[PDB]
C-alpha cells in the first residue's frame, strides 16, 4: 500500500456555478466517495478503513493506492494566488512529509505554471512526488477533463518515485518549472517547450528516467519560506519609453525579469539603456528571458541585452525565471555578485546550459 | 509583366558580421544581380531593361515578374523599430502605390509581427499584396533560409491578388495581423495561432480563398499616419501590486493592452481593481488579451476582467491589439464610446467574433 | 428526451483477459448500470423507466439522453470482420431506424476505418448520427481511454444533428470515410489526413458546420446490401512482377484498388502495363490511390498510372476507395463507363475535387 | 578540404518537361557550374582545379567542400527501380570508397525509402556518410525545394562523420532505413515515424549523437551484392480470401512481408491460416509488419499472427522489412532457423527491441 495526500487548493476542477459564473466549490471528498473509479467501497469496508481515507481500485500492476483529502479554506481561483499562498502549500507538504509517500495538488490552471515553478524552488532536496493538476472543466459537469486528470495524478504519485514538482494534464507529466500555459480552451492546455515530458500515459506508461532527477536520500528536506516578494516581470514592446521603464524599476523593487525579443534583444536607444544601468547601480538584478515560446537567449546582435547586473535566462520560462529570482534574492547574506552566479546555474532542472 | 517594389528596411536577411556581431548590411541589389534565381541577365539584356530593375526567371505559369530594389538608409535591426519607422514604410508604399502591382518588405524578425500588424491598420482599403519576409540566417551565409523566403515572397506578390499585409516564411503565407514569433532559432519561426495560413507552398500552391479578404475596388487607399504613440502593453503576473500598476498607467498614457491569464482573468484584489477604475476615469482605454498563445478571452469567472473602459480582445494577438489601439486612438474627434466600439469590431481580419 | 441505440459489436473496449490474451467480453449493460457517469439511477427510478434502458446524467444544456444497449452475438475482434458483418450492422440500423434518434457503434479499432467507410456508403440519405468508437484499453481496466470515448460518442449522437457516419476518439469527431489508423499504441490512434475533424471537444464543443453534410429530409433512407464482394486491394512494391499481378487480377475479381507510389505512379515496364490492359479488357475496374498518408493522386510523370479502366482516387483513403468500389460495382444495370464516372465523383464526402 | 562524390541516378530533382510530363534530365554538372551557391568559380580558377570537379563557397566554420558529379546512364524515374539498380549504386560507392570522404545520392522520392533501406543493408561496416536526397520539384523550375535539399546534403556529408545511409529533406536528416513517404505534394514529404531525426538544420545544426551509429574503423567495408530477388510485400485487407493468398505465395517466392492490422493482427479464418502454414512447409519466410504508420507489432490478441516461419517485424517499416528480407535470404549457407533469428535482430538501426 502507498498513501498519498491530496491537497485541494481551488480552481476549475472543483468549481460550481453561482450567479452565472464559476467560483471555487467545497465538498470534494463527499463526491469522490460516490465514484467507483476514485473509491473502492468493497475494499474499504473489507479493511474497515478510516472513513476520511479513500482507496483506488486495483491498477494492472504495482501496489494499491490510498489517499487522504485535505481541503484548504478558503478555496481560491488561481488568478488570485500569490507567493504567500504557495508558501502555505509548501508548509502543508513539510508538516505531513513523513506520513505520506506522495502529494497531489489540485490547482487552478491560470497560474499553475507559476505555482509549480515556485514550489520547485521552495522544496529543496525533495524526495517524493508532488504532482499538480487541474482541469478546463469542473468534475461535476458530465463532459470533463477532470476525472482523467485527477486519476492520473494519483496513479503517477502513487506508483512511481519521481522526486520533482510536476504537472499532470491530458495524459502527460511535465517538469513543473518547465511548463507554460498555451491554450485557454483546449484540454491540451500546457506545453513544456524546451524539455520533453517526464512521462507519457497510454496503454504503457513511458518514463524518461534519463531526465528524472535523482533522489538525494542523504540530504534532508529544506523548505524555503524566505522568498523575496518585490520581484516583477516586464515585457518589452517596440518603442517602450525610457520614462516608463524608469518608473517601473523604482524602489522598492529588487529584481525583474525582462521579457525581450527573439534570441534576447531589446531596443538599443541610449536613454533606455541608461535607465537599466541606473537601476543596476541602485542594486537591481535583471534576468533576460525570451518572449518566444521555444528557444534560448543567445548573444550575437548589436541589440542583445547583456552587462551590468543582467543575467541571461537561457531557455528558462518566465514563470521559472521569476520564481528563481524570488528564491535567490530571499537567501540571506549574499553579495549581488553571488546572487547572479546562482541565477546563472541550473538549480532544479529549469535551465539547460550550453557547450 | 507585373512590377514589384522590394523595400529593404533591415534585419538578419541582409546582415554582415562586424565587431563579432550581426549588424545591418548594405548593397542588396549588387548581390541579387549575380544570382540567376533572382535575376535573368539574358532577358534583361534582350529587353535593354533599366539597370536598377531586376527580373525573375519565368515561373511555371503566369506573367513575368520584375522588381525594383529600394534600400532604406540607415538600415535597422528590427528590435530598434518604432511606430515612426512603420509609418515611413507605409508612406513609401503610398507614394509608389500606382506604379507597382505589389510590395515586398524585408524586415527583421524580432518585431515583424508588430510591423505587419501596424501596416495592416495604416493601409486602409489596400488592394495589392504587401508581403513581409525575413530570415534567421543572412543571405550571404551559404546555408540559409533567406534565399527561399525572399523568392517566395516575390512570387506570391508577383502572381496573386491577395490584398493584405502578409508574412511569408518557410513555405507559408500568414495574415500579418495574426502572427506571432514562437521560435528564436528554428526556420519555422512564426505561427498563426488562431487562423489558418492564407497559403501554403509545395508542388502546388494552395490558397485559402475562403479566408483571403476581398478587393474593395470601389474605395480608394487611405493611409493613416496619425497613429497614437502613447500606448503600451502590460503583462500581469501573480501578485502584481496596485502601486506598480498605478505608476505604469500614469499620464501621458492613453491606451494599454492588459495581458491577462487564461481566458481573460486577473487578480481581483480590490486595490488593483481600483487603480484600473481610476485610470478609466482619467480616460484611459484598456484592451484585455490572453497571455496564452492559442484561444480567446471569454467571460465566465469571478476573476474575469470586464467593465469601465475595458474592451475584450477576443482572440487577437497582443501585437495586433497594440497596433489597433494605436490606430483607433489616433483617429481624430471620436468619443470614448465610439473608440471602444471600433476596438470591438474586426477591422482587418485580426479578430474572430463568436 | 433523445433515445439512442448503442450497438456493441466487439473490440478492445469490452474485452476481457482469457488464456493470457484479450478476447471479446460480454455483459456490457450490467457494468454500465453501476457507473454514475453512464447511468442516473435516481432519474431512472423516478421515471419507473424500462430496466433494459439507461440514462445519462444531465449535461449543461440540451435534452436528456437515454440509450438502449444491443449486444451482438457472437462478439468480434475487428480483424475478423468482412463486408457481410458491416451489412449486418447496417441492417440493424435500418430495422430500428424509426425508433431512435441516433446510433453509436462500439467497434474494434483494427478495421474501424474500413467499417466506417463501408457504412457511410451503405447508408444512403442518412439523416441521423451513426458514431463509431472504440478504445486501445478495455473499460474494465482502471486506466483507460474507453470511458471518455464512449461517453463522448453518446453525447455527440444525443445532442447534435450530424447526419453522417463518424468516428469519435480522443476528444475528436472525424468524418468516417476520411479516417485511417496511424498508431497501434497511443490513445491518439486515428487521423483524418485530408480533412479537418467535424468537431472538437474541450471547454466548448466546436463543430465545423461548413463541412457537415446537409439533412435531406425529403428523401428516405436506402440501405444498400448489394455490395460487391469480389473487390481487392493491391499494394505495389518496387519490381513487383507481371506474373504476380496477372495471378492477382484473375477472375472472379471485379475491382481492385491499386496503392501506388507518391503522386500516383508505378513501374512502367511494358509487361506489367500489359497485364493491367488485359484485365481492363476482361472488364476489371481499377482505382489508383496513393500509398502516402497525405495528399492527392495527380498526373504529371511518365510513370503515372492512367488509362483503360483506371480511375484516379484523388485524395481518398484506401479504406474509402475500397468501400466505394464495392458500392458502385454493386449497383444494378450500369455500364462500365457510368461506373467509372460514379467512382470519380464525391458521393459521401470522401473525396475533394480540384 | 573534404572531397565528395555526387551520384545522380534520376528523379524529379533533375527532371525536364517533355510531351507534357516529367522525365529524367541529363546535364547536371553543366547547370550546377552556373550557380554560385553550388560552384565558386573564383576559387576553382585560383586553384586551377580539375574541370570535372566543383567547389562549394565557404561555409561558416569547418573545411572547404569539393565534389565530383557522376551522372549514371540511363537516368531513372524511381518508380522503375529494382534491386539490381540499388546494387549498381552500392558497387559505385565500393569502387570509389577510398577516394572520397562522403557520398550524396540524388534519387527519385517514389521509392527512396526502399533504396535507402536496401543500401543500408548492402553497405556493411560503413564508415562514411551516404546521404540520399531528392525533391518534389525540379531544380530547373524556379520555385523548388531542390536547391536547398541538394546543398544541405552536400554540407552534411561534407562536414560531419555520420556513418550511415541517411535521407536529407526539408532541413532534416533521417536514418534511411527508418523513413517512409507520407505526403505526395508538400515539401515535408518524409517522416521517420519510430525514431527521431538524426539531425536538424536551422541557425544551428543539432545532431543526435546518442543515436548515430559508431564508426567501426577496425572492420573493413563489405558490400553484399547477393540479394534475394524473389521477395514480396502483401497487404492484408478485410476479408482477403484464402484462394488469393494461396496464389500470391506460390513458388518461386521465397519471402514475404505481411502487412497486418494494428498491433499485428489478421483474420483468423482457418482456411487463410491454413495457406500460411502450407507456405511455411514449402520453406517460405514471413515477416509481420504493421499497416499503421507509428506501429509496433506486439502479441496479445486471439487474432495476432505468430508461429510457423512468421517473424515479428516489431516497429520496422515495410520498406526496411522487405530489404532486410532480401539481405538475409541472400546470405549463403544458413538454415531457415538462423535466417529467422537474423530477421528478428537489429542489424542496421532499423528496429527497436522493446521495453
Ligand atoms: N480561473 C481558473 C481557471 C482553471 O482552473 O482552469 C483558475 O485558475 O482557478
Ligand atoms: N535581430 C534581428 C533578428 C532577425 O532579423 O532575424 C532583427 O530583428 O533585425
Ligand atoms: N484487436 C482489436 C483492436 C482494438 O479493439 O483496439 C480489434 O480490432 O478488435
Ligand atoms: N516520380 C518521381 C517522384 C520524385 O522524384 O519526387 C521519382 O521518384 O523519380
Automatic annotation (TrEMBL), chains A, D:
It is an enzyme of class 3 (hydrolase). GO terms for biological process: aspartate family amino acid metabolic process. The keyword Thylakoid does not apply. One of its GO terms (molecular function) is asparaginase activity. Its EC number is 3.5.1.1. Residues 4-211 form the L-asparaginase N-terminal domain. Keywords: ANK repeat, Hydrolase, Repeat. The active site is at 109. Residues 230-341 form the Asparaginase/glutaminase C-terminal domain. It comes from the Eukaryota. Substrate binds at residues 78, 109-110. In the N-terminal section; belongs to the asparaginase 1 family. This is asparaginase.
